[PDB]
Design a protein around this ligand. Structure first.
Ligand code: EAM
Length: 127
């Protein structure tokens, strides 16, 4: 069994910013989800080898996780908040696409997504 390379978290060619919205995405949004009891399956890329999911990366072609998002935020990988918000939404969508309705993992994603939406609802205006 083989995992793909992880998503990119570093690229000197990619233009970067440190904005108040991106700071909020780290300090409020990422931190709130990371500390949650249901955070652990989402704190690193899906390990298809260890989890015995040989079809995971056959079905999921745009992998994303909070480990990657955390690295992207801490290393100022993004230009804007929209990029980061998309990463969170890709993470949730992947979970819903791969898994069955009512699965424990789907309920975990839903609880995290509820908090995500609550926090992004009060994304600050750009300074
Ligand atoms: C048929 C079995 N299905 C799975 O294992 C899917 C897997 N399901 C889980 C998972 C996590 C928690 C529970 Cl209670 C049940 C399943 C999961 C657990 C992990 O442990 C390190 C990593 C990624 C996960 N994950 C994510 C994220 N999206 N799908 C899955």
């Amino acid at each position: 069994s083989m995992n793909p390379p992880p998503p990119e978290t570093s690229n000197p060619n990619k233009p970067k910013r440190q904005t108040n919205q991106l700071q909020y995405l780290l300090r409020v949004v990422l931190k709130t989800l990371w500390k949650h009891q249901f955070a652990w399956p989402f704190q690193q890329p899906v390990d298809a080898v260890k989890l015995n999911l040989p079809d995971y990366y056959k079905i999921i072609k745009t992998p994303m996780d909070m480990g990657t998002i955390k690295k992207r935020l801490e290393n100022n990988y993004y230009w804007n908040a929209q990029e980061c918000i998309q990463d969170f939404n890709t993470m949730f969508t992947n979970c819903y696409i791969y898994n069955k309705p009512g699965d424990d993992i789907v309920l975990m994603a839903e609880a995290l997504e509820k908090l995500f939406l609550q926090k992004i609802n009060e994304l600050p205006t750009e300074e």
